C-alpha cells in the first residue's frame, strides 16, 4: 500500500486536512492506510472513514445515474443510434464504483468487523457493509444480483439485531442504520411497506426516548429523526 510508510497518526491528521479541503479521494486513501495499520478505530476515526468513502461513492453514484439516464433514453424507439460510447462510459464509471465498494467491503472483512466487539463499533461497520452492498445492488444485473441484495439485507439485519439489544432507540448509529435499511427496503428490495413501517416505528420509538437526553444528544437524534420523517413524506 502506498500509505504503508506513513505513520498512523499522520494519516489521520491528513484525512482531517483532506476533509477541510474537500479532497475526499485523498481522505479515503489516507483512511484506508490508517485501517491497514491493523489497529481498531476510535469513534472519530470510524466517522472519518465513513465520510470519506460516502463522499467518493456518492459522487460516483450521481455520475452513474446521469449516464444511465442518457443510456436509457438512447435506447428508446425513435432515438438516433449514437454507438457504443454511452454504454462504455457508463460501464467505466460503474466499474470504478464497484472497485471502491469492493475496497470498503474488503477493509470491513479484513479485519474491522471481526475485531469489533462493542455495539457502537460493530453496528457501525455492519451498517457500512449493508450500505456498500446496497451501492453494488444499485448497479447489479448479473447472476449474483440476488446474492448482492441478500448480502446487504443480512448485514443490515445483524446490525439491527445488535442495535435493538444494545443501544437506546435514540442512538444516532441505530437511527442512521434504520434510515438506510428502510431506504434499502424501498429502493432495492421492492418492499415499500416494510420501508415505511421501519421508518415509522424507528421515529416513534426515538420520540419516546428523547426525554432522557441532554441538549446536545437531542440535537443529534432529532437531526436523523427529521430524515426519517422526510422519507416518510416522500413515500406517503
Amino acid at each position: 500500500g502506498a500509505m504503508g510508510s506513513m505513520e498512523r497518526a499522520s494519516l489521520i491528521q491528513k484525512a482531517k486536512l483532506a476533509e477541510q479541503a474537500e479532497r475526499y479521494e485523498d481522505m479515503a486513501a489516507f483512511m484506508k492506510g490508517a485501517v491497514e495499520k491493523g489497529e481498531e478505530l476510535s469513534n472519530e476515526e470510524r466517522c472519518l472513514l465513513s465520510v470519506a468513502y460516502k463522499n467518493v461513492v456518492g459522487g460516483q453514484r450521481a455520475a452513474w445515474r446521469v449516464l444511465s439516464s442518457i443510456e436509457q433514453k438512447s435506447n428508446e424507439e425513435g432515438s438516433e443510434e449514437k454507438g457504443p460510447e454511452v454504454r462504455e462510459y457508463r460501464e467505466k464509471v460503474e466499474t470504478e464504483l464497484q472497485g471502491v465498494c469492493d475496497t470498503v467491503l474488503g477493509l470491513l472483512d479484513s479485519h474491522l468487523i471481526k475485531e469489533a466487539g462493542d455495539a457502537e463499533s460493530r453496528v457501525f461497520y455492519l451498517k457500512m457493509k449493508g450500505d456498500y452492498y446496497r451501492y453494488l445492488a444499485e448497479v447489479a444485473t448479473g447472476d449474483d444480483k440476488k446474492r448482492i441484495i441478500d448480502s446487504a439485507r443480512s448485514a443490515y439485519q445483524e446490525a439491527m439485531d445488535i442495535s435493538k439489544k444494545e443501544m437506546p432507540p435514540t442512538n444516532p448509529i441505530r437511527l442512521g442504520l434504520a434510515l438506510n435499511f428502510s431506504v434499502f427496503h424501498y429502493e432495492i428490495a421492492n418492499s415499500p411497506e416494510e420501508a415505511i413501517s421501519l421508518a415509522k416505528t424507528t421515529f416513534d420509538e426515538a420520540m419516546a426516548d428523547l426525554h432522557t437526553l441532554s441538549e446536545d444528544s437531542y440535537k443529534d437524534s432529532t437531526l436523523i429523526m427529521q430524515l426519517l420523517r422526510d422519507n416518510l413524506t416522500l413515500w406517503t
Partner: peptide, 5 residues
C-alpha cells in the same frame, strides 16, 4: 432520492 446517512 431519499435521505441516507
Amino acid at each position: 432520492f431519499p435521505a441516507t446517512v
